[PDB]
Motif scaffolding. Sequence first.
Motif, short mmCIF file in Angstrom:
data_model
loop_
_atom_site.label_atom_id
_atom_site.label_comp_id
_atom_site.label_asym_id
_atom_site.label_seq_id
_atom_site.Cartn_x
_atom_site.Cartn_y
_atom_site.Cartn_z
N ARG A 172 10.65 -3.57 -3.10
CA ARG A 172 10.64 -3.37 -1.65
C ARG A 172 9.28 -2.86 -1.18
O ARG A 172 8.75 -3.33 -0.16
CB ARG A 172 11.74 -2.40 -1.24
CG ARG A 172 11.71 -2.03 0.23
CD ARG A 172 13.01 -1.41 0.69
NE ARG A 172 12.98 0.04 0.61
CZ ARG A 172 12.69 0.85 1.62
NH1 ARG A 172 12.42 0.39 2.83
NH2 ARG A 172 12.68 2.17 1.41
N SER A 173 8.70 -1.91 -1.92
CA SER A 173 7.38 -1.41 -1.56
C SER A 173 6.34 -2.52 -1.60
O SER A 173 5.50 -2.63 -0.70
CB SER A 173 6.98 -0.27 -2.49
OG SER A 173 7.71 0.91 -2.20
N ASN B 65 -0.42 -2.47 -4.63
CA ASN B 65 -0.34 -1.23 -5.40
C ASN B 65 -0.17 -1.61 -6.86
O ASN B 65 0.91 -2.03 -7.29
CB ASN B 65 0.81 -0.36 -4.90
CG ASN B 65 0.74 1.05 -5.43
OD1 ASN B 65 0.43 1.28 -6.59
ND2 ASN B 65 1.03 2.02 -4.56
N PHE C 150 0.61 3.71 5.50
CA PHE C 150 0.83 2.96 4.27
C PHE C 150 -0.06 3.46 3.14
O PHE C 150 0.29 3.31 1.96
CB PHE C 150 0.57 1.47 4.52
CG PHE C 150 0.75 0.62 3.30
CD1 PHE C 150 2.01 0.28 2.85
CD2 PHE C 150 -0.35 0.15 2.60
CE1 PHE C 150 2.17 -0.51 1.73
CE2 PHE C 150 -0.19 -0.63 1.48
CZ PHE C 150 1.07 -0.96 1.05
N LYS D 155 11.34 7.84 -4.98
CA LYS D 155 10.71 7.04 -6.03
C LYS D 155 10.08 7.92 -7.10
O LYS D 155 10.16 7.61 -8.29
CB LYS D 155 9.67 6.11 -5.42
CG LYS D 155 9.73 4.69 -5.96
CD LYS D 155 8.39 3.97 -5.82
CE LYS D 155 8.52 2.74 -4.94
NZ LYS D 155 8.58 3.10 -3.50
N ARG E 239 6.80 -4.85 1.43
CA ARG E 239 6.30 -4.24 2.66
C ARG E 239 4.78 -4.22 2.69
O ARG E 239 4.16 -4.45 3.74
CB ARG E 239 6.88 -2.83 2.80
CG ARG E 239 8.37 -2.84 3.07
CD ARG E 239 8.81 -1.62 3.87
NE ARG E 239 9.41 -0.64 2.98
CZ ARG E 239 8.73 0.32 2.35
NH1 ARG E 239 7.43 0.47 2.52
NH2 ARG E 239 9.37 1.12 1.51
N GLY E 240 4.15 -3.93 1.55
CA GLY E 240 2.70 -4.00 1.49
C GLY E 240 2.18 -5.38 1.79
O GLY E 240 1.20 -5.54 2.52
N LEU F 175 13.32 -0.61 -5.76
CA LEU F 175 12.48 0.16 -4.85
C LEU F 175 11.02 -0.29 -4.92
O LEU F 175 10.36 -0.43 -3.88
CB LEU F 175 12.60 1.65 -5.18
CG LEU F 175 13.98 2.26 -4.98
CD1 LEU F 175 13.96 3.75 -5.26
CD2 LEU F 175 14.50 2.01 -3.57
N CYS F 176 10.51 -0.54 -6.12
CA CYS F 176 9.13 -0.99 -6.25
C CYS F 176 8.94 -2.37 -5.63
O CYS F 176 7.90 -2.64 -5.01
CB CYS F 176 8.72 -1.00 -7.72
SG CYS F 176 8.45 0.64 -8.42
N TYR G 2 2.65 -0.02 -8.91
CA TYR G 2 3.97 -0.60 -8.75
C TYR G 2 4.13 -1.87 -9.56
O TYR G 2 5.23 -2.15 -10.06
CB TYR G 2 4.27 -0.88 -7.28
CG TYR G 2 4.45 0.37 -6.44
CD1 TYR G 2 4.82 1.57 -7.03
CD2 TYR G 2 4.27 0.34 -5.07
CE1 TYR G 2 4.99 2.70 -6.28
CE2 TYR G 2 4.44 1.47 -4.31
CZ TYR G 2 4.80 2.65 -4.92
OH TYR G 2 4.98 3.79 -4.17
N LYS H 232 2.64 11.61 3.22
CA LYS H 232 3.79 10.88 3.74
C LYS H 232 4.94 11.82 4.04
O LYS H 232 5.62 11.68 5.07
CB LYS H 232 4.22 9.81 2.73
CG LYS H 232 3.39 8.54 2.78
CD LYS H 232 4.12 7.38 2.12
CE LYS H 232 3.15 6.39 1.49
NZ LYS H 232 3.39 5.00 1.96
#
Lengths: 458, 458, 458, 458
Positions: free
Chosen positions: A255-256, A283, A8, A25, A259-260, A252-253, A286, A15
């Motif tokens: 979702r990130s 983040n 992560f 992204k 998940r974080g 997308l941001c 984001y 990554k």
Amino acid sequence: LRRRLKYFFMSPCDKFRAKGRKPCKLMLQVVKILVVTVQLILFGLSNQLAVTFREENTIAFRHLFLLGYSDGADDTFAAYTREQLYQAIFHAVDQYLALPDVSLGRYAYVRGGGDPWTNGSGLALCQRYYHRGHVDPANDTFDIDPMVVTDCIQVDPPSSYKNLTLKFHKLVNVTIHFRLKTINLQSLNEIPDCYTFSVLITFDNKAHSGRIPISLETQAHIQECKHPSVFQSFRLLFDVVVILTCSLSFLLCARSLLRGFLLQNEFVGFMWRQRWERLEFVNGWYILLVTSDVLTISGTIMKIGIEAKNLASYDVCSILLGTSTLLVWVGVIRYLTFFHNYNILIATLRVALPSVMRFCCCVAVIYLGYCFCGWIVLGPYHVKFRSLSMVSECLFSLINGDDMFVTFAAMQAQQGRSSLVWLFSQLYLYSFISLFIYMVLSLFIALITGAYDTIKHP
Amino acid sequence: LRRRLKYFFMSPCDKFRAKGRKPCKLMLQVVKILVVTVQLILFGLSNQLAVTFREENTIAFRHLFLLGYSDGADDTFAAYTREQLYQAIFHAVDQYLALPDVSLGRYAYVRGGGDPWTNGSGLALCQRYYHRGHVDPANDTFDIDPMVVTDCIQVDPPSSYKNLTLKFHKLVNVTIHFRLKTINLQSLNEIPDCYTFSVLITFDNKAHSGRIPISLETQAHIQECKHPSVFQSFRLLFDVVVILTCSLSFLLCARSLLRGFLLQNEFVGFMWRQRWERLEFVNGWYILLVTSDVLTISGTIMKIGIEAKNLASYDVCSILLGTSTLLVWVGVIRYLTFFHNYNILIATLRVALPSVMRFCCCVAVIYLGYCFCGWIVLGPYHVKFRSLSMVSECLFSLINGDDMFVTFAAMQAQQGRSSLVWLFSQLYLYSFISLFIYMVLSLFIALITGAYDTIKHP
Amino acid sequence: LRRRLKYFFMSPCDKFRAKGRKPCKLMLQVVKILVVTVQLILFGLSNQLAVTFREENTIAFRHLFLLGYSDGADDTFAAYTREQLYQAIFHAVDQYLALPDVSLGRYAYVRGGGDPWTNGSGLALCQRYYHRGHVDPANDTFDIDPMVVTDCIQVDPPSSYKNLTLKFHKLVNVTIHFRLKTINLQSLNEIPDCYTFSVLITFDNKAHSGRIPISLETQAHIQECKHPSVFQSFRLLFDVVVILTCSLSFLLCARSLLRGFLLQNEFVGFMWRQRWERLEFVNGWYILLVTSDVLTISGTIMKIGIEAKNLASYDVCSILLGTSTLLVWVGVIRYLTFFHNYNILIATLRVALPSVMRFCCCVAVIYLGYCFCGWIVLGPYHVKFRSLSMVSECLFSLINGDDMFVTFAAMQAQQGRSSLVWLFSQLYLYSFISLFIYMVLSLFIALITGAYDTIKHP
Amino acid sequence: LRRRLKYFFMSPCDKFRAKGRKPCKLMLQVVKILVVTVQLILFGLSNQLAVTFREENTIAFRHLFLLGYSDGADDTFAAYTREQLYQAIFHAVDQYLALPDVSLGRYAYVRGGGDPWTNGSGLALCQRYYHRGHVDPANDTFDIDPMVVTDCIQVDPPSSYKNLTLKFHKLVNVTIHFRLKTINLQSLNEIPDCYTFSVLITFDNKAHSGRIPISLETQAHIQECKHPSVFQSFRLLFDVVVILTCSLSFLLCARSLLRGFLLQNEFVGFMWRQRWERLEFVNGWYILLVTSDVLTISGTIMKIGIEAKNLASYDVCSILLGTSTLLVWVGVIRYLTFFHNYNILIATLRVALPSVMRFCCCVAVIYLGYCFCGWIVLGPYHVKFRSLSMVSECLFSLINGDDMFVTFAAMQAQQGRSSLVWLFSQLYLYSFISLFIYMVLSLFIALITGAYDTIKHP
Ligand SMILES: CCCCCCCC(=O)OC[C@H](COP(=O)(O)O[C@@H]1[C@H](O)[C@H](OP(=O)(O)O)[C@@H](O)[C@H](OP(=O)(O)O)[C@H]1O)OC(=O)CCCCCCC
Ligand SMILES: CCCCCCCC(=O)OC[C@H](COP(=O)(O)O[C@@H]1[C@H](O)[C@H](OP(=O)(O)O)[C@@H](O)[C@H](OP(=O)(O)O)[C@H]1O)OC(=O)CCCCCCC
Ligand SMILES: CCCCCCCC(=O)OC[C@H](COP(=O)(O)O[C@@H]1[C@H](O)[C@H](OP(=O)(O)O)[C@@H](O)[C@H](OP(=O)(O)O)[C@H]1O)OC(=O)CCCCCCC
Ligand SMILES: COc1ccc2c(c1)CC[C@@H]1[C@@H]2CC[C@]2(C)[C@@H](O)CC[C@@H]12
Ligand SMILES: COc1ccc2c(c1)CC[C@@H]1[C@@H]2CC[C@]2(C)[C@@H](O)CC[C@@H]12
Ligand SMILES: CCCCCCCC
Ligand SMILES: CCCCCCCC
Ligand SMILES: CCCCCCCC
Ligand SMILES: CCCCCCCC
């Protein structure tokens, strides 16, 4: 759990090595920067032409309707005698009546359609005074009913207005209202749109000081012309593209971020089992990206509405789009953080920021004290110290070494009127400037230097 | 004794833990900041309107009475021929006589009431010349008795003054004095007050240079109108509240100072028994607070007097209230000293200050030398170098990088008139600016940086 | 020898303890500072009045003799048609003839006394053209003998000059010369002195460009009036006192320098017996003091001569006296060097100075390169880049952050005329400013900081 | 191989000791600096006169041909009524016809010779409008064929043009074209050359805003006069000398570079036998010298062509010569690098440069974001924010503390029109200036200081 956590927090290259997923992204963010900047540039270029058209028409109106007007005289333009005021009023009305024969522009008259105009009238010449206005300075007496009465003459486009009799002793103001319709030809590669300028000429006597300032102001209502014909939808498509790009980036941001947050919860639970710190999973880049996406989408919706002439809120739309563009260009810094030599500098700024903000608070209290003192003492004698915002602007410019000598010179022409005030101004200015230049700015430098040393020598 | 001493030096939170006394002084100081700032804001807002009224009336007077006057011409407005001077004088008197029919303001005449007016006269046109004034430049001879004779014509409000014959060769000056009464209507949410403007128009020939500057000046005497009637005491209550708050704060701070002095005496005696260092018991913040309280109380008494039209010393009252407000907002720093991260910065400034002041003395001697040299050499050729205070303002602005190119450009227009002076000005300006920007400011930065390092690494 | 050497290097307090001699030189230097500063102040105050008198008379002359003149028009005042030029010339001559009836000053005519005036003439109207001047641009031909012929008409004080016929195609210039005598009355607490203004009005056609600038200039010759009588020698005594003080200081400093040199010789000889380094015996402060004494004595002699009207070299005298005053006020630093906390700062500056000067050389070469580039490229398009000294002034101001936006804005109005030049100007300005602000000034700061660290941590 | 390599890297003095070769390149470079600088100075002095001649003639043309023109009015000069426009046009044509009788210059007419003039015509008065131009703002209708039709009247030098009838509603612009021939007499110590000024007067209605700006522009074509005769080749020789010097320097530097490359190849091969790093053999100073030689040679060829009147590309030639002069004066730094105390400073700058450039990239992204936001939001309300280049110039000036208060004051007069925009401008300006002054410039200082510490304490 340890491996997933370590993944992560890897960099994009790490990554890519670890899992091989093509980074969608980053490319999306680059495309977003490009399209958002292009949209802003096109919008600004389009708005510039409309601004120029409005301003040029208003300058022409000032030259046509204000007797004896010249450029650069806007702030001091005023009448000082009764005949001057009558001549200005009558000249404005006569020029309104003569407009088709003399003007270089092509203007159509507008009649009726609400107040202050009556049904068939194009120009409203209105005088506002006090209901009861007895004023006798000889005996130091006055009897005033401050209720404002409006008496207004109506003029049809091509002389009753020539019989105007002003109530000078109780006069509040005089206004001239009229509307002119014109077609914006220079739009030609758009289609010309139809402007209605509402023109207000004000002769203001609210100060009752023997000086009556005169001003002309315009409001432009823009619409689409009914029958446009120019001999021989990409903007909307581009707006849709921008909205789609920003929506994809937002998804997308988000979702990130989700998940974080999930990983943060799992880590906290596992640690509690085994046994400000949580924000490490957030983040911030984001959050910035999501904010910019939202601002861009709102601004683009408003821009679509405005370009169809269904809305006129240029200020809010421009603020939204400009702030979002600023945010994306700032977010470009994230990419530089991935390379060590640039990360040294960015990390120096980051470590310095908290102490810089704390010192900003310390500076703020002293600065505010100086602002209040200067406003109360110098405001009666200095044009730059009339209001608190102006005082702050002057002091901030002095800190940066701008407009210093003129500030001193304005006070120079009071050494005879009030020696005490002149001496106080000397002490005030010299102490403020010396304290801020020798000590405050130096301390900001020291904070940055100490942060840099900490980064370079851990 | 050790316990009491250690309590005397604890922080507010430590004191609260130790004895549980609710901190009255801190809340009192917060309330004091609030009320003093609000009082200052209200006072300044009220004074702004009066300043604007006076200035607008004076601008109107300049336009009404000064023949051929235009805005921005105040400094250069002058006569150069005898007919010009006569026309200006006669125009001023004729406009005074025509005022009721032409002015946009409402003014009442004032007759008599002391010099230079006689009992029934509203306007005084006075000419001042030398008692004996023989001047013959052809033979380079002159016989002058410098005693000034005043001959003055009296004009009643609605042409003997048209027979004025000026003694040009021995003329010292010409003055026109008159008073106008008006009511300040825009005060409406106060009650209108009655203004008496005393207007002085000066045609000044003291330089005897062929150029006679013309100026108009006003003094405003404000009083309450005898019979004010506006169709349909919180300020005084607020002033009383401010005085009470400042008095309570003064009493508490004085008690704290006295107790500190008593403990200092006890400690000194005990140490003498056992066996600059005393000032450690003096709380400087309390001295600042007491000074602020005294200034605020004096200024509020003066403000009460002024707002009743019993006093007219605006300058002193404003200086008192502004300085006290600056002091309380500075004293806000004491609260920040209680938190470690802010105390780091404040302590850095405190440790730096002595060396900064010493270097200020070092800088002062060199700066004064440059001021004297520039005044003597460049003053004949440069407008910014005419007086010593102006020279100092120019040099201080140059240190801060303001108004540099115009200073050079003024000298540019003398490269042919005097090559030596132009070369000297080049050397003088370049050396001064280079010395102060490369070396002096850098040393201030170094002092602050060294202080910060000492604080961060004890 | 060791004891005598160690005494030669003691501080004033140490010397007083060692031998008890009362320090005469220090008190003498303090008295010198006082008297030199007072002399300079009195001199400057006296010169200010004369400067103001001359300038006011010249402004009056411009208003009297230049047709259509207004304040602030000096640089652009010019004629553009033949009738304009004729009207300006004839107006100047007619005003000269009408002066006694119209002027507010009192002027006497001056006749004859050398060229360009004949014996009985007060005004000379002279036209200068080419000896042979055939110019035919239609055929691109010209035949010119560049030898200048002068034809000049003589006018006596109260119309042959009305028959002036200008040779426009070969005209070089037209000049009007005349002298006026006046008495400076405002000197009254001096005795009025007699001024002769020589007035030159120039209509300049040397550029042959269709635009003929018009200027008026004055030279003032001051003398004592023959028969001054004002109804009812400390300056010279003060000058003598200053000279005596400076002479005594010079003698004492010279004796100290001689004794230092003798001790240096003895030490060198003794070391040679036993067995840049010698300058350690040279007291630089005494060299500075001796220079100041010499400058002051010369300037005071010239000042005495000037105040008697026997000399008119104000520039050299002012430069001498101002430089000496600057030097004594700088020499005040020696006293501060005796106290440790001030010596820290002074020693920091002293140790920094060599590297600062070396970096100044490094900066100088790059600066000169930029000056040449800017002069050649931008001079055709930018008012601030016309001459090399102007270019240097502009660049130096830019380094200090003054007048930057106007420099950019002047180039802004060439983005269409020459895109290449505008782009080059962008690169030139941005690179110069960025290099000097980010790097050069930072290095000066670093040099000072390093010197300070060396002083604080030996 | 080791000995040859060590010789390749020795300093000039070390090389002289090692092999005794007299250093030809160093003396050649000194001579090159001298001759290139002298050539630039002579070229600039010559160009200044031509620039002044053209500008003075153009100012005279503005005064002669533009009705009611005054200095400083160029940007605002415009017509606002039909009669104003007609009067301006007719005045320009009448002045063209009257020029020989009224002008102070000597001008010859030019007839025919291409468009827009016909064979015998000297002046072209051309009107450009739309092919079909129906505009009816009353009904919000328009029918426009945007194809531009030109109708132009021809005037011979000494009234058909008096019958001009302008199509105001569809008018695009009006232009007046004519050429005047004159001889530049002030060149006298050159031979006078023949100028042809092509004068274009534009009345611009492309905005269709009721305001028609009026401008005058000139293009000067310079040639040699056919028959020049002034009663009673060093420049070319000097240009040849400069070319020869630069060619010799180029050859020597190229030989040095080639030998360095050969040694680099030999070293790489030997190391490969035994077993970014190669650039150590590249002498950057020689690359700079070769570049300057090439630029100087090209610029001198162009200068020779221009001075013969065979070319007119002053901009490119000036840019080449100025850039080369800047480069040689920068290359002077190489000599200072040979002395240790100067090398300390130069090496500090060199080691700092990479991090300075990286931080410049970091700053660039944030700066660009602010530029875009300010352009979109403030451009409609602020003159300094109209275009992106202007926005950048304003922000860069603000960073350096120039023109700050006026930037704030321009926004001050919108606090009523749009409170939201005024508040945004406050936040935008304060945040930008604070961020750049407290943090960015401080970091540049820290980078330089760290580099200096690294150099001083290896
Ligand atoms: C809520 C629904 C959201 C939309 C669907 C999301 C589906 C989705 O992300 O798939 C992966 C790729 C790449 O998506 P992208 O965000 O570029 O890639 C992810 C990021 O690199 C993330 O790291 P950070 O960026 O540092 O947070 C990483 O942890 C994830 O790996 P992990 O899963 O092993 O943890 C990656 O999958 O996504 C697309 O290629 C979208 C465009 C094509 C599909 C568009 C459909 C409209
Ligand atoms: C000379 C007469 C002065 C006025 C009477 C003084 C009576 C008085 O201070 O009582 C304690 C409280 C709190 O007063 P306040 O000043 O807030 O509290 C004191 C301070 O905290 C002081 O520390 P510093 O602030 O650092 O010096 C501390 O040493 C004292 O403890 P100690 O005694 O053990 O040494 C405290 O009592 O005071 C009020 O609550 C006044 C408002 C209500 C009464 C108003 C009457 C007009
Ligand atoms: C390609 C042909 C180029 C032209 C001929 C070149 C002939 C030529 O350089 O001879 C040596 C001297 C001095 O030439 P110059 O360049 O001043 O001297 C050389 C440099 O000092 C070089 O060091 P760097 O400067 O650091 O690279 C060094 O390595 C060479 O020694 P080395 O040979 O042992 O390696 C020197 O010979 O040169 C003249 O004195 C030219 C003027 C007179 C002749 C002009 C003829 C037109
Ligand atoms: C007319 O004579 C003056 C007028 C001003 C000043 C001095 C002499 C001498 C001390 C100076 C002061 C202006 C402000 C300073 C430059 C401070 O910043 C440091 C020393 C100060
Ligand atoms: C016209 O040519 C010039 C005019 C001025 C200067 C130079 C050349 C070259 C040295 C420069 C000097 C101006 C002042 C400095 C910038 C100092 O601050 C450091 C070096 C100086
Ligand atoms: C998560 C690291 C900090 C980034 C915050 C956003 C900076 C604008
Ligand atoms: C007693 C600590 C120092 C506080 C003095 C006041 C600062 C303005
Ligand atoms: C002898 C110590 C140095 C003093 C030189 C003079 C400084 C201006
Ligand atoms: C080869 C050392 C660096 C020199 C490069 C040129 C500097 C302008």
